[PDB]
Amino acid sequence: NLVQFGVMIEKMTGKSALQYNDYGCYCGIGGSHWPVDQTDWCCHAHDCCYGRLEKLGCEPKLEKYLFSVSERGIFCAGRTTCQRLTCECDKRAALCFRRNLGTYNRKYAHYPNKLCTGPTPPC
Ligand SMILES: Cc1c(C(=O)C(N)=O)c2c(OCC(=O)O)cccc2n1Cc1ccccc1C(F)(F)F
Ligand SMILES: [Ca+2]
Ligand SMILES: [Cl-]
Ligand SMILES: [Cl-]
């Protein structure tokens, strides 16, 4: 249930959402070992954000929220607090991606999971 996040990613980065799937060791489902770069740390932080939401009773993988983008930035909304929290985790990630556009490297898109090595940093 990832239409909204993808749309947020595209608005904020100018790239297709597909460019952030399987990026590094953390972007995409699950993740492990040490983040390859700052964009990947965004995804590590995002996974941590979702785990916090799951411990609150939310289902952030499934929640559908509402959002807009102006110049003031990204405005999050939703009927429930869980939807709004999901939007906040995604927003922080999309902003993090935009902020690190400067070190985004195409070589890490679709990164083979065997190249993920090191310890798994804690949340
Ligand atoms: C960037 C990202 C994710 C992350 O932010 C992350 N931390 O792993 C992500 C994701 O993470 C949620 C999680 O693993 O808890 C699952 C599926 C696709 C994901 N993607 C890619 C993505 C995002 C939005 C819409 C579509 C896609 C996709 F996969 F189609 F490219
Ligand atoms: Ca992930
Ligand atoms: Cl976060
Ligand atoms: Cl609803």
From Swiss-Prot:
| EC nos | 3.1.1.4
Question: What triggers or suppresses the expression of this protein?
Answer: Up-regulated by inflammatory cytokine IL1B.
- A GO-annotated cellular component: extracellular region
Q: Which InterPro entries match?
A: PLipase_A2, PLipase_A2_dom, PLipase_A2_dom_sf, PLipase_A2_His_AS
Q: Which GO terms describe its biological process?
A: arachidonate secretion; inflammatory response; lipid catabolic process; low-density lipoprotein particle remodeling; phosphatidylcholine metabolic process; phosphatidylglycerol metabolic process; phospholipid metabolic process
Organism annotation? Homo sapiens
Protein name according to UniProt: Group IIE secretory phospholipase A2
Mutating residue 46 to A has which effect? Loss of catalytic activity
| pH effect on activity, per entry | Optimum pH is 7-9.
Protein role: Secretory calcium-dependent phospholipase A2 that primarily targets extracellular phospholipids. Hydrolyzes the ester bond of the fatty acyl group attached at sn-2 position of phospholipids (phospholipase A2 activity), releasing various unsaturated fatty acids including oleoate, linoleoate, arachidonate, docosahexaenoate and lysophosphatidylethanolamines in preference to lysophosphatidylcholines.
Protein residues bound to Ca(2+) 2: 22, 24, 111, 113
Instruction: Quote the catalytic activity from the record.
Output: a 1,2-diacyl-sn-glycero-3-phosphoethanolamine + H2O = a 1-acyl-sn-glycero-3-phosphoethanolamine + a fatty acid + H(+); 1-hexadecanoyl-2-(9Z-octadecenoyl)-sn-glycero-3-phosphoethanolamine + H2O = 1-hexadecanoyl-sn-glycero-3-phosphoethanolamine + (9Z)-octadecenoate + H(+); 1-hexadecanoyl-2-(9Z,12Z-octadecadienoyl)-sn-glycero-3-phosphoethanolamine + H2O = 1-hexadecanoyl-sn-glycero-3-phosphoethanolamine + (9Z,12Z)-octadecadienoate + H(+); 1-hexadecanoyl-2-(5Z,8Z,11Z,14Z-eicosatetraenoyl)-sn-glycero-3-phosphoethanolamine + H2O = 1-hexadecanoyl-sn-glycero-3-phosphoethanolamine + (5Z,8Z,11Z,14Z)-eicosatetraenoate + H(+)
Q: Which UniProt keywords apply?
A: Calcium, Cytoplasm, Disulfide bond, Hydrolase, Inflammatory response, Lipid metabolism, Metal-binding, Phospholipid metabolism, Secreted, Signal
What does the UniProt cofactor note say? Binds 2 Ca(2+) ions per subunit. One ion binds at a conserved binding site (GCXCG), whereas the second ion binds at a flexible site and may act as a supplemental electrophile as well as a backup.
Active site (catalytic residues): 46, 90
Q: Which domain of life is it from?
A: Eukaryota
User: Top-level EC class, please?
Assistant: hydrolase
